[PDB]
Amino acid sequence: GNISRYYTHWSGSLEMTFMFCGSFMAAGKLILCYTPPGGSCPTTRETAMLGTHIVWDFGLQSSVTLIIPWISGSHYRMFAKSTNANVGYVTCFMQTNLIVPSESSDTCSLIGFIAAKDDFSLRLMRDSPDIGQLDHLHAAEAAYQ
Amino acid sequence: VLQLKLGNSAIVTQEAANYCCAYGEWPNYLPDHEAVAIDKPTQPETATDRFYTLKSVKWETGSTGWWWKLPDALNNIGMFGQNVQHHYLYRSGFLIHVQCNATKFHQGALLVVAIPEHQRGAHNTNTSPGFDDIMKGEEGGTFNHPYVLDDGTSLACATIFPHQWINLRTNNSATIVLPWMNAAPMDFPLRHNQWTLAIIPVVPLGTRTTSSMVPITVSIAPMCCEFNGLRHAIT
Amino acid sequence: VLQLKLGNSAIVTQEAANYCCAYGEWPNYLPDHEAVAIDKPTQPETATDRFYTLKSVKWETGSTGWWWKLPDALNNIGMFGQNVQHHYLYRSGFLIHVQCNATKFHQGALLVVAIPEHQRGAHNTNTSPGFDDIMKGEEGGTFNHPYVLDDGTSLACATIFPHQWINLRTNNSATIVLPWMNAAPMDFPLRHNQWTLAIIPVVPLGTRTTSSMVPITVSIAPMCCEFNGLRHAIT
Amino acid sequence: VLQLKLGNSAIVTQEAANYCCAYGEWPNYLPDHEAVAIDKPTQPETATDRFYTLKSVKWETGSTGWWWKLPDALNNIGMFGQNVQHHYLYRSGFLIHVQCNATKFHQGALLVVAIPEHQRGAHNTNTSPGFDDIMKGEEGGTFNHPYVLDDGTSLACATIFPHQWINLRTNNSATIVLPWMNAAPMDFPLRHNQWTLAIIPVVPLGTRTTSSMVPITVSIAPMCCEFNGLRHAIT
Amino acid sequence: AIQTRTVINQHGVSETLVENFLSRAALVSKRSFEYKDDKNFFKWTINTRSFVQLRRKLELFTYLRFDAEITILTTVAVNGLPDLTLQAMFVPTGALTPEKQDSFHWQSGSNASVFFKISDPPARITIPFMCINSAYSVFYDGFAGFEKNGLYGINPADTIGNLCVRIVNEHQPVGFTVTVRVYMKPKHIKAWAPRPPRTLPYMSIANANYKG
């Protein structure tokens, strides 16, 4: 996210990783649904299994490498307020209910990761607007005095 | 080698470890010596050769069983349900991956059995089962009398069909790979169902707490679909 | 060899006899060194590589011209119009077969010209043409000022584009085979139109009876379609 | 092959199964072309190449994180803490073996991350962190704001550093093998800390009983120590 | 706010090189001084922490090794227009820095003075890598003073040195303001141990504090 805000034009595959962080006894299912760009985001789990998805039972399998094909996009300006339209979604619906025993906690969590593959590329370097000085920095004149 | 990853759909489970080629037959396309079957069956790619994961059915202690007639379970769903409502023929085997996720403190045994031509019977009447009693769709149906499989013939002998046991002590999953099981080379999906995935809990679910709502998740992959053509060149 | 027979659609005409490879380029798929274009463009077969025959436009004496922007002419029609409303990319050349059936007692000359990037202009105002002024669809549009092609630039020089003449004395047909004409390798069909099939009657229709309602029939075949994938394997 | 057995210290665990060579670099001694670094660095043997196991930190549900700056964590401890208080130089990589023992009924995820040059920031003030705010020692420190790692930069991107995940579902241990990470060839242990072992629980600990006091035990082995000489022959 | 998209046709990884990422002549210092003959000259300790655009961009890395290519851009504004001679004397670590415009340190032969005029093209000097460690510690987890309650995070080795700019001309009848823009293009850049990009705004140029 933050290195692609130093560059205007950017294009390439990404790679998600969803690590489940419940107990060892905690079983259940998720359905991780990659919607391509231009398609509609699934609202129900029925619509979610119609498209590209992956039904992930977290038994011993607690992590999912999830290759996303070619999230691209850039910045725009006309004769601003022109962003990228949409490059799709990765939604997750409860396929089953969560099953924990009486000693494990009822509330389990998910950590999601994101990485780029070797085909991800960046160009037309710009300045990232994530930072910006407005009033002052403390002892900024101490580099001169 | 099975690799439960068909098309855009995939099932990343860990403990699957075996599958059952039903009647020892892997599903294939229509063989080339059967040209009688109208000359243009299209062979659709992974648009329909993909896992259609149904609702997870809530398996409690007092549950009798579940049945999904194939391909009635998939006539309303997705690119198989779209192709059924346009093509009048089809020829598809099925890959079913039933898995019943549970802890090590649950018990039970599912007879995940795939019944070819499960002509159901109605109980205590001479009227045949109607269209709404047989053709259910995505929800499937619940066994009224699972000891006689709702056709008067015994559950104890129902392992003559292709079946796997989900004994929640040992395994949580069952994978049954169905071939084209019909007398006809192709058939008619809106009014005929070759297979019936029947999941009958022989040993009921048990745990000391309140009645456990353990889900059984069914994923049906129509392997090696064919259909009517509809794109024929009229010269 | 052209053989106007694409997919299930076909045009059995007799007097076609020539076609115009637009800018000398036959339409092809996306070349393999352009992998940047997202990794899964599907290459759809004759589901969309087929003739979409529009309405026959009623060419009278006082008709100015007709224009169909491609692929705006086919975004509501059939398996191309279904794929446009789901896929956000496409890369398709076009085969256009315009023929104007008439007797040997009719006269006229059609400049059946295919204009790449026909950015239209509005007449006598500084407001740009709206969405409903540009994107017409199956009906297409009629030229307001065909001498300046509705963009201020001359009809007399419009033969710089790929064009064929339907001189009703000589031939009734025109076949223009369009390649992928864009700076981008793939593009966006609901908001961009690479080509514009423009049919401008330079010499108007003439016969001594009442104003002859001679039809001009347009058949647009999207040759060598590609699209977005939508069936990618997320591993 | 790792073999967590250094010197007289050893860690007989069973489930370790992997280690992370930090930045792909195994710790080594000072290379022989860097003679500038004063001519006598002693190369101490397993007097300091041994596991210094700290206090087990009590990881509850409301715990934010822990950080041990290396080698500030070991300047008061044992033969490394004795040599720091006499030698002014050192050059040591580190082997860290963090393991968080828990049952199969606990949950959580530790980002056991080793941060080179973790210049901490103070919260909501412009005064720099003091000597007692940075140099903690054997107890280490607790993260005030672990989402920004107490230096304003994000925890979500903190996996750019050498890190391993202790997901208590999968593994209880993390082993990070640190090389000499400094611009200088040797450095000064009482006033500089190259690494900072940061253990941040991203997913907090959870169990239905009272707030579980699960210990996280840190064992830091200063692999491939060097120091000042102090035994030079003045001829 | 409209929502457009375009096919991004790219080729190559060469623009994301770290040599290519950081070598932009960014403005690193800009102050004006009145002149009439600090006491009417421009001195500045060369750091990259003055502007948050280059600072966060360089705090992506732990260790940096670069030749700073300082370009002193000097403009002048009168409170007739004179032609002036300036001295952008670079004062390294150890050489003393001027306190007045006419001190004895401006004529130091060992300091790398550059004498340039306003009507000339801007003065440009390549200040070499002068950390005495083998890389600039962008973050220095540690203290300068040995167990002293002083200042945290200041490496004694990472001092570039004061860049001291004065006007070589003596007293003149007009008083005028001189704005000295210093442009630094780091080059021959090696960079080690990448870091997370900073999210919270800075509070000081001395340290990595945060408000939230």
Coordinates of C-alpha atoms in Angstrom, one line a residue, chain A residues 4 9-16 34-37 66-74 84 86-90 114-116 119-122, chain C residues 36 38-39 88, chain E residues 6 8 10:
Chain A
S4 CA 2.7 2.1 -4.3
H9 CA 1.1 3.9 -12.2
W10 CA 1.2 0.4 -10.7
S11 CA 0.3 -3.0 -12.0
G12 CA 0.8 -6.6 -11.0
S13 CA -0.4 -9.7 -9.2
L14 CA -0.8 -9.7 -5.4
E15 CA -0.9 -12.6 -2.9
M16 CA -3.0 -12.7 0.2
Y34 CA -12.2 -13.1 -5.3
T35 CA -14.5 -10.9 -7.3
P36 CA -12.8 -9.6 -10.5
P37 CA -13.0 -5.9 -11.3
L66 CA -4.4 -16.6 -2.2
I67 CA -3.1 -15.5 -5.6
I68 CA -4.9 -12.4 -6.8
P69 CA -4.5 -11.9 -10.6
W70 CA -3.3 -8.4 -11.6
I71 CA -4.5 -5.6 -9.4
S72 CA -3.6 -2.6 -11.5
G73 CA -4.5 1.1 -11.4
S74 CA -3.1 4.6 -11.3
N84 CA -9.4 4.1 -9.8
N86 CA -12.5 -0.7 -8.7
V87 CA -10.0 -3.6 -9.0
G88 CA -12.3 -6.2 -7.4
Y89 CA -12.8 -7.6 -4.0
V90 CA -11.8 -10.5 -1.7
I114 CA -0.8 -9.1 1.5
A115 CA 2.3 -9.4 -0.7
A116 CA 3.2 -8.7 -4.3
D119 CA 5.3 -9.4 -11.8
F120 CA 4.2 -6.3 -9.7
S121 CA 5.6 -3.1 -11.1
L122 CA 5.6 0.6 -10.3
Chain C
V36 CA 0.9 -7.0 -18.7
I38 CA -4.0 -8.9 -16.9
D39 CA -2.8 -12.5 -16.9
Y88 CA -14.7 -5.1 -17.9
Chain E
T6 CA -7.1 2.3 -17.9
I8 CA -1.7 -0.3 -17.3
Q10 CA 4.2 -1.4 -18.1

